[PDB]
């Protein structure tokens, strides 16, 4: 600590006085995260063996909630033509918990691959299906040109190119009839500078990549302030209070000492906040408990030493904290 002041003052002679050098902080010893039991596992690999998928606006959904999803059967490694992923890989979803999961399957074009993205616009994004901002998964795609493609175009599948307005996330339109396309309603039957909203795939196996079918499977993810029902492959790492730990509670990740308080919360209020809009007190999603968030102790380091020509004795001072280690 005598040399800590030498590098702070950038000199080999330390004059008498008090000088600040570093900042001490208590690191978390363990990780306390608590969520209840797992319900079921999502069909990540069961939708890859389907014979034919739905269209862009027709996407079929199988509802299996409570991530962790199925990590066992994974076809996503080097088995397909193109891999475009966002967020984290599905192998890493075992460390995260999501509320609801909707497995969707649809076929798009070459120029429509770049339009796939959470919270982004596009022809199929706004007018057909939009990815929510809560989706951390990978977008799986493969080239179906050897199957779904037909001579002169395949009109079996359909898609909607135009709509009177953009669709919000998690919204569907199954209507195949003639409705308003642009901003000026033409009152039913096509004409008056409007366009027929429904469209058909023109897939020709002999043209470029933009005109060829690509089977895309996306599992819709949802993340809210609702309490999570699952934690990891392992759950509790049983709580021991009055210690510095790293906690994730109801989706709020932080580091601090967990203590019990007298705070009275409403049954439907999951967690509160302080005047700083930061985590203050939270409730146990698994069982009935009330925990208060106390961040771990930290402060500045003060060095009290006499002159270099006087003595080498050094007194270390911690500001506004109690030392339990020493």
């Amino acid at each position: 600590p005598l040399s800590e002041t030498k590098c702070t003052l950038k000199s080999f002679t330390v004059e008498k006085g008090i000088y600040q050098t570093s900042n001490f902080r208590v690191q978390p010893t363990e990780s306390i995260v608590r969520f209840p039991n797992i319900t079921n596992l999502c069909p990540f690999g069961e939708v890859f063996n389907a014979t034919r998928f739905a269209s862009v606006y027709a996407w079929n959904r199988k509802r299996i909630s409570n991530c962790v999803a199925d990590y066992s059967v994974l076809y996503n490694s080097a088995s397909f033509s193109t891999f475009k992923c966002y967020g984290v890989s599905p192998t890493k979803l075992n460390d995260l918990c999501f509320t609801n999961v909707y497995a969707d399957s649809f076929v798009i074009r070459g120029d429509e691959v770049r339009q796939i993205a959470p919270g982004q616009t596009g022809n199929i994004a706004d007018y057909n299906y939009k990815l929510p901002d809560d989706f951390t998964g990978c977008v799986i795609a493969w080239n179906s040109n050897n199957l779904d493609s037909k001579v002169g175009g395949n009109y079996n599948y359909l898609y909607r190119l135009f709509r009177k307005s953009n669709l919000k996330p998690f919204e569907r339109d199954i209507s195949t009839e003639i409705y308003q396309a642009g901003s000026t309603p033409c009152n039913g039957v096509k004409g008056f500078n409007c366009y027929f909203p429904l469209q058909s795939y023109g897939f020709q196996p002999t043209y470029g990549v933009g005109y060829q079918p690509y089977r895309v499977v996306v599992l819709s993810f949802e993340l809210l302030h609702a309490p999570a029902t699952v934690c990891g492959p392992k759950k509790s790492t049983n709580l021991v209070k009055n210690k510095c730990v790293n906690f994730n509670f109801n989706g709020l990740t932080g580091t601090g000492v967990l203590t019990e308080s007298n705070k009275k919360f409403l049954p439907f209020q999951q967690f509160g906040r302080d005047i700083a809009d930061t985590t203050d007190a939270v409730r146990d999603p698994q069982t009935l408990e009330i925990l208060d968030i106390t961040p771990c102790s930290f402060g500045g380091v003060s060095v009290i030493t006499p002159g270099t020509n006087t003595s080498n004795q050094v007194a270390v001072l911690y500001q506004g904290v109690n030392c339990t280690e020493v």
């Binding site: 998690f170 009275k264 919360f265 439907f268 209020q269 509160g272 906040r273 203050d280």
Partner: protein, 264 residues
């Protein structure tokens, strides 16, 4: 079922002012001894809510838009209102939503509903051992393609009919957040004949419905085949707007005051 009542007549839309009504808990965050401000869809203060009533030969059940959000204020004695219906076309062409109050639990189901022109529930034989129990279900004949089902927690409700001024009061707020419905419920005794009393109350959440259906209109499936009559009931429908509340929180977390400025 498909035949409207012979006593059904559209009533004049009278108006009245709601002093503090329209305030609720914006979120689940708890605070104490501080003043928080947030902007959500709210009911403005001192607004004009449409005044409705029901007697034994005048009954009206108009349809109002759900687009900007609505505020439900219902004062009752025997708790006439059994719920509401949500739907766009109000037919089997698309999905619909119902809320049924049996004075035991809450029945919430999303199916394909065949909507009769004048839906109701058969109630008869009130002389010996009335009990005011539901008997006939006229709302829909059949259901199919059910995407949602829910059962709530048990509660208690007073079905006893009384004479004189109203006693019980219930204020509901139904708002859609990005495809999610949230229900607010509060019950307090009041003494009221017509209009609204001056007071303050807080609206606690009840059930959050993760359905995702878009509802452009709501019809009236509440009190009580044209020979059927109606009783005494009254309810209100408000209009929600993206307002801003400044709320006070006490040591117990209850809201003691509400301030929304656009007035003074």
């Amino acid at each position: 079922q498909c035949v409207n009542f012979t006593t059904r007549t559209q009533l004049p839309p009278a108006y009245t002012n709601s002093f503090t009504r329209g305030v609720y808990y914006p979120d689940k965050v708890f605070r104490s001894s501080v003043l928080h401000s947030t902007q959500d869809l709210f009911l403005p203060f001192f607004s004009n809510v449409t005044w409705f009533h029901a007697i034994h030969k005048r009954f009206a059940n108009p349809v109002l838009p759900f687009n900007d959000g609505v505020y439900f204020a219902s004062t009752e004695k025997s708790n006439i209102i059994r719920g509401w219906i949500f739907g766009t076309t109000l037919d089997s062409k698309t999905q619909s939503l119902l809320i049924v109050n049996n004075a035991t639990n809450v029945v919430i189901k999303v199916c394909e509903f065949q909507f009769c022109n004048d839906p109701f529930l058969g109630v008869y034989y009130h002389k010996n051992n009335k009990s005011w129990m539901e008997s006939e279900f006229r709302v829909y004949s059949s259901a199919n393609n059910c995407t949602f089902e829910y059962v709530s927690q048990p509660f208690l409700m007073d079905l006893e009919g009384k004479q004189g001024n109203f006693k019980n009061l219930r204020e509901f707020v139904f708002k859609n957040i990005d495809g999610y419905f949230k229900i607010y419920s509060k019950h307090t005794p009041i003494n009221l004949v017509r209009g609204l009393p001056q007071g303050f109350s807080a609206l606690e959440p009840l059930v959050d419905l993760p359905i995702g259906i878009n509802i452009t209109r709501f019809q009236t499936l509440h009190i009580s085949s044209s020979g059927w009559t109606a009783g005494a009931a009254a309810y209100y429908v408000g209009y929600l707007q993206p307002r801003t509340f400044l709320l006070k929180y006490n040591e117990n977390g209850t809201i003691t005051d509400a301030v929304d400025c656009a007035l003074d």
